[PDB]
Design a protein around this ligand. Sequence first.
Ligand code: AR6
Ligand code: ANP
Lengths: 76, 346, 366
Amino acid sequence: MQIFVKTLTGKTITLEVEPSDTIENVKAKIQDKEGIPPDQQRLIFAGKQLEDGRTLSDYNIQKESTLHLVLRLRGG
Amino acid sequence: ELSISLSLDSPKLDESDFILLSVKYLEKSLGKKKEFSGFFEDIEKLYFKQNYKEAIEKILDFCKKNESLLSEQVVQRLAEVAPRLKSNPKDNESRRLYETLYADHLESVIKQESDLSVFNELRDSYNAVKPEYAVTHETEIKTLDEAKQFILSFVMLNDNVELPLKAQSERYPKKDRSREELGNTPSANPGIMKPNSPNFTDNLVPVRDVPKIAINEKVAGGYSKTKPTTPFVASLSGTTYSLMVVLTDYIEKHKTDKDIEKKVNQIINLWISSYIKEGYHSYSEVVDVLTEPFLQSIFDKANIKLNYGVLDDTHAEFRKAQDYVFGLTIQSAMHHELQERFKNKE
Amino acid sequence: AALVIDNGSGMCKAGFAGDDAPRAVFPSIVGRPRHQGVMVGDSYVGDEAQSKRGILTLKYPIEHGIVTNWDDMEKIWHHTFYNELRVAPEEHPVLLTEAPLNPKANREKMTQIMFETFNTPAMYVAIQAVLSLYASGRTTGIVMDSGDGVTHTVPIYEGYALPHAILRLDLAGRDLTDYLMKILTERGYSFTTTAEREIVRDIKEKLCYVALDFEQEMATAASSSSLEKSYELPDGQVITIGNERFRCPEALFQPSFLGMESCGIHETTFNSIMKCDVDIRKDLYANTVLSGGTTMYPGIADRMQKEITALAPSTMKIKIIAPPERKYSVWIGGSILASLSTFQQMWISKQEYDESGPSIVHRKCF
Ligand SMILES: Nc1ncnc2c1ncn2[C@@H]1O[C@H](COP(=O)(O)OP(=O)(O)OC[C@H]2O[C@H](O)[C@H](O)[C@@H]2O)[C@@H](O)[C@H]1O
Ligand SMILES: Nc1ncnc2c1ncn2[C@@H]1O[C@H](COP(=O)(O)OP(=O)(O)NP(=O)(O)O)[C@@H](O)[C@H]1O
């Protein structure tokens, strides 16, 4: 399948996944394409922060679905 | 009560433990005298404010003006331990329990007072400011636990809408939460109590996973270094900035209301109760965000004077923290004699 | 002159503070007679309920570690005070022991009953596994207590039993005695009757031990008589005991033997240690204190050193502490605590109970 992760810029990352890919898994792909450290990553779907220990099948996250990415910021 | 002199032995006595142990000693010896009603009434508020230095001074002065009514070794031992007292954010257990209890009382007081109509009125400030990824809140709030589910979701506004406010702050950059991912450890203790810390049996909670946050000590002027009295749970709260965004929209939409200070106070106070209860933060990890001047301005220019949870009486929790401190320090002396008895079986 | 009473699943150990051993050890049993008529001329405690259990109907109120019937608990307690210790409890402050993971409502009935029913001057409640650690002179480490009806893995940090890591296995001496009964009836000896239970429990506490490698001991029992021992029944017959000797305690490490999908005491200790902060685990791994009669098997501490090392990291320092006195470890830790002078300020007093009620125990004994 497929999904689109949108940023707070509105740019659209397209990550091909298989529905048993964990949230831990998708953040890693995201880092590989974009370099973002997986630990600043917060992915939202249906208004809920996705826990990286579950899967896309567990969130009913499906093909052509959009996720939201919000990067954590701890500089102080 | 010789017990007080055995509690004062503990190497780990902190400033909080002192105030609690000294005040309990004084209130037994000279007790019920309503002449002295004042002195303890005012120390109880001083402890709450976390103004330990002042209280310590008062406490020793009490034994200065009232030495005749008190035991000499105790008065002199307290005087001796006092100069060396310190507070450590990693370990502030008496205060951890105290605040965890205080926010039960602060939840009762919000419950007696509020009809939850401000939490229904604050729905449309939330839905106004939320990011698009945040879920529109459509329900009616009829109980304090829905206002509590609602209130806490402001965290969704984090990392995005709260940033313009977050940047104005001199305090927040002195935050010291280690970037280490430590995960979650199991706990049966409530609030800002630590998982492995002792507790009363009436005071346990259903076992759950709790997050482990490390202090970053390499931070210059770091908050746990500036205000050591405050227990470390997660350093300075930045979700305060998000409630600040939601609240600012409320003050605008409700500026003509005459009950607005009461209502904004209810919201602010429930937040405090809630962060403490959930273990997210200590009181001064929230209040110390709010009281920075630039944010005080929002309230002041609208004539909102916030009480920041200061209640009329903190007694029941003061006295309960006193029992805890007592029983832990006598257990430390209990442990000390014990190991020094087992050193002699060789 | 303080009193100490270990309220255990199988039997109670009772005695006085300062003594190296409990003065009274007797079954946790109350016979209530199966018919009236043996009451002409009205319950039974401990050993005497054991002898007359044909006429009586036996309840174990502490079965599994937590007091179940209080009407029967009072009896066991009255029996302990006036008969076994031959003491007026209104004379002696009473330190009492409780199981790990005891419900808060139970600790209040113990307190309430001690003050209201027996009118004691003072009293304290203490966790059985915490006192065992104390008899070994530690404040931090993980206790493995195996008794009659219950096994508990209890991590203790600085005096505090960690409720979020306390693990319970209902497998202990009673089950090992039943399983031995079964093993020996497969070999042709006949053990069924409760007296035949009572004899089998003798063979357990003498002849049984723990293999270090179960396979090699098996292979040695099939290769020679070296491990066989004989035993003289009451009635004069001498029966021979083979690999039954170590297959009995093996049910602790391998509970499948009795048909239970549980984890073995080693895995339970590992799992209990894993439910604590990573930060305190070296300390639990370095202080695993064995306690209770079901740990008394020869060679239990080495096997556990073998198994926890196989489970823990390669770098972990692993110490099993198995003190020769660990049978009464709970009670002895009881007696030490009761005799400390510091502990003279830790008692809950009668004045206090009246001022508060049974809820004083939550703020006093914790
Ligand atoms: N996966 C999550 N799911 C739901 N809520 C979360 C999650 N993670 C954090 N929170 C919520 O965070 C609130 C407690 O805040 P606190 O962690 O004490 O420190 P702060 O206030 O300065 O920042 C919060 C950040 O923690 C992380 O960095 C997040 O990214 C946040 O940006 C609670 O309401 C939680 O429900
Ligand atoms: N040398 C021994 N070897 C093997 N098992 C023994 C030995 N001595 C006693 N036992 C068994 O140990 C079991 C537990 O006795 P005990 O330790 O008093 O447990 P408990 O009464 O349930 N409470 P606790 O004191 O907390 O362990 C008894 O059932 C015995 O059958």
